[PDB]
Paper text:
We develop a hierarchical approach to designing multi-component protein assemblies from two classes of modular building blocks: designed helical repeat proteins (DHRs) and helical bundle oligomers (HBs). We first rigidly fuse DHRs to HBs to generate a large library of oligomeric building blocks. We then generate assemblies with cyclic, dihedral, and point group symmetries from these building blocks using architecture guided rigid helical fusion with new software named WORMS. X-ray crystallography and cryo-electron microscopy characterization show that the hierarchical design approach can accurately generate a wide range of assemblies, including a 43 nm diameter icosahedral nanocage.
To build such structures by helix fusion using our building blocks with smaller and weaker interfaces that give rise to cooperative assembly, we systematically split each DHR at the loop in the center of four repeats, resulting in a hetero-dimeric structure with two repeats on each side. Tetrahedral, octahedral, and icosahedral assemblies were generated from C5, C3, and C2 building blocks placed on their respective point group symmetry axes, connected by the split DHRs heterodimers. Following fusion, sequence design was performed at each of the two new junctions. For another design, T32_Wm-24, while the full cage did not assemble, we were able to crystallize the polar-capped trimer component (C3_HF_Wm-0024A) and solve the structure by X-ray diffraction to 2.69 Å. The structure clearly shows that both of the newly designed junctions (from HF and WORMS) are as designed, matching the design model.
Residue numbers in the entry:
A (entry chain A), B (entry chain A), C (entry chain A): 1 to 269
Write the structure that this text describes.
Amino acid sequence: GKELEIVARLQQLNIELARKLLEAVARLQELNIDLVRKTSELTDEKTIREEIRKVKEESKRIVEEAEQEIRKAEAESLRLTAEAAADAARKAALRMGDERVRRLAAELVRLAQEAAEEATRDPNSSDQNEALRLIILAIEAAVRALDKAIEKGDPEDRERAREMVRAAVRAAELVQRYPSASAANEALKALVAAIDEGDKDAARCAEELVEQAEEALRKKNPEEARAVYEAARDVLEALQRLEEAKRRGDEEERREAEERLRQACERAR
Amino acid sequence: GKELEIVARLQQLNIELARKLLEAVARLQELNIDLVRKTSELTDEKTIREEIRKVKEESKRIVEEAEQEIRKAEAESLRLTAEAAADAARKAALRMGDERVRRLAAELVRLAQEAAEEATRDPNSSDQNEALRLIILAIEAAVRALDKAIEKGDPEDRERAREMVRAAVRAAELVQRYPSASAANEALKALVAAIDEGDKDAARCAEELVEQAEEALRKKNPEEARAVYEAARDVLEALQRLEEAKRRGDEEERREAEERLRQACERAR
Amino acid sequence: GKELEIVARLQQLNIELARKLLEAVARLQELNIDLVRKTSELTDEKTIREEIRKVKEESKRIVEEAEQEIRKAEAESLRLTAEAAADAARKAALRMGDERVRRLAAELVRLAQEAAEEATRDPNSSDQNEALRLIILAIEAAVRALDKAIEKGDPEDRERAREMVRAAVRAAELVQRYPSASAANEALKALVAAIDEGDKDAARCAEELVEQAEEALRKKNPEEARAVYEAARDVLEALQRLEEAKRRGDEEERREAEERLRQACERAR
C-alpha cells in the first residue's frame, strides 16, 4: 500500500543525493588538478595566489551547496515519514470506533501536514527540522498505543490510547508554535517514553510537564521555562533507564528506576 | 512480509553505494598527494606535465566508474520496487474476486518483470530507466485503485478499479515498446493523475490520449506524435492543479481547474 | 506499524552517513588547498616534504574514520532489520496457533537480539557482521514459510513451516557460536534456498549438512569442516539453478537441476 510508495520515494532521494555528492567530488577534483597545473607553469607569485584563493572560494561554495542538498533531502524525507505516520494514525483510529479519537487523529494529520510543509519551505532552519522529528515520534507513539488498544479490546487499553493520543496532539501544537523552546522539546520526549511504558502515573506526569511548559511559554519568563526543562529532563532519563532495566537486567535496578521516575515526578508537581 | 525484505535489500545498496563513493574519494586523494609530491621534487617540465595528465585521466576515470556504480545501484533499486509493487497488485486483485482483474494484474507482474530485467541489463540507458519509473507509478496507481474498491464494496468503485487497472496495462506495454517516445511518456503520467482523481471523464480522456499516441507510434509520423504530447501535457498539468486546488485553496481555482481539464480534453478528442 | 518506524530510522542513518561523507570530502579539500599554498610559497625542501607527509597521514586518517562511520552505520542498519524480522516472526507464529512454533519463534527473537547486539558492539568484525546477515536471511525464510502455512490451512504446509522454522533456529545458534566458520556459513544459505523451494528432500538434506557442520565444529578437525562446506556448496548452487530454471527456462534444464540437487545430496549423506 502506502508503505511501499514511501520506500520508493525515499530511495529516489538516496540515489539522487549520492548522485549530487559525487558531482561535488568531481568538481572539487577538477579544481585541484587545474590549480596544480597553473601553479607549476606560472612564475608570478601574485597570479598564483589569486588562482589559489578563487579555488578556495569556489571549493567552499561547492561544499556549502552540497550541505544545502543534504538539507533539502532531509526535509523531504521527514515530510514523507510524517505523512505516512499520520496516514497510519487515522486508519488505527478507524479500527477503534470512537468518533472522538477519530477527531483527535484527524488533528494529527493536520499537525503533521502543516509542520512538514513549513520544514520543506526552509530546510536550513534547525528548529523546524527538529520539531518535525518529535512530532513524528509523537505520532508513532500514538500509533503504537492505538494498535495495542485493538488487540484484546481491554477497556483500560482503549482509554489508555485515547488519553495518550490526545496528549500527543497537545505535545505537538506546543512544539509547532515554539520550535526553539527547549522546555517543550523535552516534555514531548518524556511523553513518548511515557506512552511506550504504559504507566498511568508516567502519562499524567509527562502531560503535567507539557502544561507547565505551555503556561511558561504563554508568558516570556525564561527562568520559568528552564525549570520545566530540568524537571522534564530527569523524568525522561528515568523512563529510558526503566525501559533498559525491564528489557534486560536482573530486576535489581528495575525497582530502583521506579523510584527515580517517582521522585522525579514528585518535585515536578 | 515482503515489504521488510525490500527495505533490507535497498539498505544494503545504500551502504554499498556509500562504501564505493568513499573508495573513489580515497583514490582521488591519493593521486592529489602523489602529484603534489612529484611536482615539488621534479624539475623537468616535460615530466611534470605528463604526471599531471595521467592523474587527470585517471581522476576522470574514477569519477566515471562511480557514476556507473550509482547507475547500477539505481536500476537494482527500481527492480526491487517494481517487483514489490507488482506483488502488491496481484494480492489486491485476489481480494477483489474478479478472475478478469486477476488476469489483468497478472500481466502487470509480467510487465514489471520484463521491464525491470531489461533496465538491469544495461543501466546506462536513460530511456529504459525512465520507462521503468512510470510503469512503477502506473502499478502504484492501480494498487491504490484496487485498495479503494474493496473498502465499501461500491459497484462503481469496483468497476472504476477494473477500467483503470486495464488502462494501466495499456499504458505500460506502450512505454515498454517505445521507451524513447515522449508522447507515450506523457500520456501515462496523465493517466496516473487521472486514476488518483477518480473522475470518469478524466480516465476516458487520458486513455484516449494513450490510444492516440499508440496509433501515432504504429506508423512513424513525428508530427503526429508531438501533437499527442502537447495534448497530454495540458491534460496532465490540469490534473495536477486540480489536485492542488482540492487539497487546499479556497474553492475559487478549484472550479477553474475543472474547466482547464474540460477544455484540454475537448481539443484532444 | 513497526515497518514505518524502521524506514524512518534507516533513512536517518542514510542522511547522517551522507552528511559525514561530505564532512570528510570537505576536510580533504581544505588540506589540499593549504598544501598547494605552502608548497608554492616555501623554498626549503625539508619543510615542504614534512608538510606533505602530515597531510598524507591526516588524509589517510580522515578516510579511515569515514570507513568506521560506514561500518557503524551498517551494523545499526542490520540491527534494525533483524529486530523487524524477528518481530514479524513472532506474529506469524501467533497466527498459526501452535504453542510449539511460538516457542520456536520466541528463540529467533532471542537469537536476533543477541547477534545484533554483539555486531553493534564492535562493527569492525566482519564475521559478526556476516553472521548477522545470514540470521536475517534465515528469519526471512522462516517468515515466508509461516505466511504460506496460514494461506489455505494445508496440514502439510503447516508442518512444513514448523520443520523449517526449527531448522532456521538450528542454523542460527550454529553461526552465532562459530561466526568464522565457512561450513556453518554455507549450510545456512543452503537451508534458506531449500526453504523457499518447499522440497521435502531439500529441507532434510540441508539440515543434515547443518548437523554435519555442527559435529565437525564440536571438535576442531579442519579437514572435517572443509568437507561439509564443499558438500553444502554444491547443494546451494543446485538450489539456485533450480530456482532459475523454474522461474524461466523451457523445462529442459529444470529436470537437469533436479538431478543436480539429487546427486549433490547423495554424496553428502
